Amino acid sequence: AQNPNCNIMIFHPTKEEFNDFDKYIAYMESQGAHRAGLAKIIPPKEWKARETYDNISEILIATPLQQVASGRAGVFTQYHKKKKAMTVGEYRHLANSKKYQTPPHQNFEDLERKYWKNRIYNSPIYGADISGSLFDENTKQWNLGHLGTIQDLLEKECGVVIEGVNTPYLYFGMWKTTFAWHTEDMDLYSINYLHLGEPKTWYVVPPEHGQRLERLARELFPGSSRGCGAFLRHKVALISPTVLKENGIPFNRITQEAGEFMVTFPYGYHAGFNHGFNCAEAINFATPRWIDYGKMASQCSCGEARVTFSMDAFVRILQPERYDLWKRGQD
Ligand SMILES: O=C(O)CNC(=O)C(=O)O
Ligand SMILES: [Mg+2]
Ligand code: NI
Ligand SMILES: [Zn+2]
């Protein structure tokens, strides 16, 4: 079995190997990459997402989210407080202000220490989940706006035609902006490209150990757990690496830099934070190997997690028994 310790693997495809996305994902998996839950892909040196980032300031962040924490430094929840719209130019200026900028630090490890020590005492503003793309339409390889759709994958594997579309989303981050512990909707893959700016640190639990994370989370967030059998779908819970180590949860960590892709694999729990002003683009995707995970994915039926139009059909076809109860939560 390849990669039995479930280490995060880093790939360096040639421009020739960068031509066929599906085939490269399948290659990564042949090397055991999926066992970690997360892989890094460094694009060939000849590749570019677009020519420059000089003209992005007039993108609108219609609902910036202020991430307010509660709890203790290692174990906290965050809620998202809606703020007034601002442009990317305005947001970048805010990220760089004295109140929100990245503090002096030695290296990534020192900054990680400062994040976990100090995250809860600040409320950074996140521009999340903005429909759109920063890939040039002439970028042919690994253009997240041109991937095959999850609906076409389900049709090709299962023969059923369903409604829904699949488009990318932009994330504008600042120091301390945080992604809580989660798997993707319907335990899909995700791909994330860091277009510009400061790095993003990731933590991930191997898929084969996801239930160990879930068990800890139910112990650490006992009221949330009673309210909903899949509360990590709410994307509000944070658990530090120190706490995971104290509780013997297997995990790994890696820092993504501008110009690098990360791939999350089905049922790979992940969480992380941004180092400073940045812009990432991400999209969910599927492969044949996803199907069985989609069939077994937990669902939030308490009504908090409130998810896309396209998830309907996935639950309807892959999880017909759940459908009824899940749609009662979604309506
Ligand atoms: O970039 C972020 O804030 C979080 N991204 C993801 O969880 C992802 O790409 O799966
Ligand atoms: Mg613009
Ligand atoms: Ni994710
Ligand atoms: Zn729920």
Swiss-Prot record:
It is an enzyme of class 1 (oxidoreductase). Its EC number is 1.14.11.66. GO terms for biological process: cellular response to ionizing radiation; chromatin remodeling; double-strand break repair via homologous recombination; inflammatory response; positive regulation of chromatin binding; positive regulation of double-strand break repair via nonhomologous end joining; regulation of gene expression; regulation of protein phosphorylation. Residues 136-302 form the JmjC domain. 2-oxoglutarate binds at residues 126, 192, 200, 235. It is found in: Nucleus. It catalyses: N(6),N(6),N(6)-trimethyl-L-lysyl(9)-[histone H3] + 2 2-oxoglutarate + 2 O2 = N(6)-methyl-L-lysyl(9)-[histone H3] + 2 formaldehyde + 2 succinate + 2 CO2. Residues 8-50 form the JmjN domain. Zn(2+) binds at residues 228, 234, 300, 302. Keywords: ADP-ribosylation, Chromatin regulator, Dioxygenase, Iron, Metal-binding, Nucleus, Oxidoreductase, Transcription, Transcription regulation, Ubl conjugation, Zinc. Fe cation binds at residues 182, 184, 270. One of its GO terms (cellular component) is chromatin. Coiled coil: none annotated. GO terms for molecular function: chromatin DNA binding; damaged DNA binding; histone demethylase activity; histone H3K9 demethylase activity; histone H3K9me2/H3K9me3 demethylase activity; metal ion binding. The modification PolyADP-ribosyl glutamic acid is found at residues 16-17. The keyword Transcription regulation applies. Disulfide bonds: none annotated. Its cofactor is Fe(2+). Ubiquitinated via 'Lys-63'-linked ubiquitin chains. Deubiquitinated by USP14 with the help of TRIM14 leading to stabilization. Binds 1 Fe(2+) ion per subunit. Belongs to the JHDM3 histone demethylase family. Histone demethylase that specifically demethylates 'Lys-9' of histone H3, thereby playing a central role in histone code. Does not demethylate histone H3 'Lys-4', H3 'Lys-27', H3 'Lys-36' nor H4 'Lys-20'. Demethylates both di- and trimethylated H3 'Lys-9' residue, while it has no activity on monomethylated residues. Demethylation of Lys residue generates formaldehyde and succinate. This is Lysine-specific demethylase 4D.
